Scaffold this active site. Sequence first.
Site, PDB file in Angstrom:
ATOM      1  N   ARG B   9       0.856  -1.183   0.000  1.00 13.35           N
ATOM      2  CA  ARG B   9       0.000   0.000   0.000  1.00 13.35           C
ATOM      3  C   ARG B   9       0.892   1.234   0.000  1.00 13.35           C
ATOM      4  O   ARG B   9       1.712   1.410   0.908  1.00 13.35           O
ATOM      5  CB  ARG B   9      -0.932  -0.003   1.217  1.00 13.35           C
ATOM      6  N   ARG B  10       0.742   2.089  -1.015  1.00 12.41           N
ATOM      7  CA  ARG B  10       1.750   3.131  -1.193  1.00 12.41           C
ATOM      8  C   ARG B  10       1.795   4.096  -0.007  1.00 12.41           C
ATOM      9  O   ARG B  10       2.883   4.446   0.466  1.00 12.41           O
ATOM     10  CB  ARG B  10       1.529   3.893  -2.498  1.00 12.41           C
ATOM     11  N   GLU B  39       7.098  -0.097 -16.214  1.00 13.15           N
ATOM     12  CA  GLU B  39       7.620   0.874 -17.166  1.00 13.15           C
ATOM     13  C   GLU B  39       6.490   1.373 -18.060  1.00 13.15           C
ATOM     14  O   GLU B  39       5.390   1.624 -17.571  1.00 13.15           O
ATOM     15  CB  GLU B  39       8.783   0.262 -17.950  1.00 13.15           C
ATOM     16  N   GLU B  82      -4.176  -7.251  -7.230  1.00  9.14           N
ATOM     17  CA  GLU B  82      -2.942  -8.027  -7.192  1.00  9.14           C
ATOM     18  C   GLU B  82      -3.116  -9.286  -6.350  1.00  9.14           C
ATOM     19  O   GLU B  82      -2.635 -10.364  -6.722  1.00  9.14           O
ATOM     20  CB  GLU B  82      -1.796  -7.149  -6.655  1.00  9.14           C
TER      21      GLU B  82
END
EC number: 3.2.2.6
Lengths: 140, 140
Positions: B9-10, B39, B82
Amino acid sequence: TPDVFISYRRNSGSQLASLLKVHLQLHGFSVFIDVEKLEAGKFEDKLIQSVMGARNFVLVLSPGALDKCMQDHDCKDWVHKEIVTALSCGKNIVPIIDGFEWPEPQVLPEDMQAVLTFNGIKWSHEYQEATIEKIIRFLQ
Amino acid sequence: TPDVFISYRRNSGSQLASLLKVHLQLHGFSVFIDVEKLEAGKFEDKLIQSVMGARNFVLVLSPGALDKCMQDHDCKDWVHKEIVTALSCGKNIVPIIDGFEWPEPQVLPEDMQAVLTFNGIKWSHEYQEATIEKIIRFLQ
Ligand SMILES: Cc1c(-c2ccncc2)n[nH]c1NC(=O)CCc1ccc(Cl)cc1
Ligand SMILES: Cc1c(-c2ccncc2)n[nH]c1NC(=O)CCc1ccc(Cl)cc1
């Protein structure tokens, strides 16, 4: 003796402080962080001697990291103590900013307001290799 | 194709996820973490492909890490997506617990409740080398 002392607020900066320790060791610096090198004896004396011993004082400023320093005029907070030692020894203080709101100097005890006069490094989650390279450029 | 996918979790697990990446790479694993290997292109497809391609799925459970998963029944949350991908592919899921309160299964969407059946590793700030050795033991 370690070249680098990492000062950090345990409840919010432990992970960044640990990451800095790994990276700096990988670039050949000897690093003091408490959980790896604070060993037996009276910790107050050891912490102060460890700050004195290291040329570099890396201060991990996670959000709220200096909150417990405010109105701590008796200098019982350990980050407060570590900063005062670094300031009085004239160490190369290198603040690392990770979501930290800079306080106005008047909210801090007089003996540590000078920490706001040192150029800091912004921790970039997106460009961590570059952050690390800038920290190394700041180290003596 | 990397051996290890790190899901985190950012707003809360970025530092630990980064620390895990460094340590796992030092021990010879190929690691996908978004800030280093996501990317160009449509990130939805690349993130699912990267989960599908990694034998190991390291899940960083910082405080509140699954709050945005709750009631995400259309599966728009990226940690939720995810986790569902790793579950559906039978990946080796390795939760890393850092101050995370285990939720009761019924507060989570049914398609990810199985995440609670996987043995986790408690991150120890005081014993980090041993935590890393345990993680490497869990990886395939
Ligand atoms: C103002 C300034 C400049 C600068 C000024 C003008 N033109 C170019 C650069 N460079 N650096 C700073 N100030 C800092 O970096 C403070 C970091 C900090 C933050 C909080 C604490 Cl508690 C301690 C230390
Ligand atoms: C219950 C148990 C045992 C065990 C049982 C009996 N006797 C010895 C050990 N070992 N491991 C577990 N359970 C976990 O580790 C879950 C980690 C976790 C936490 C949160 C999420 Cl959201 C996802 C995953």
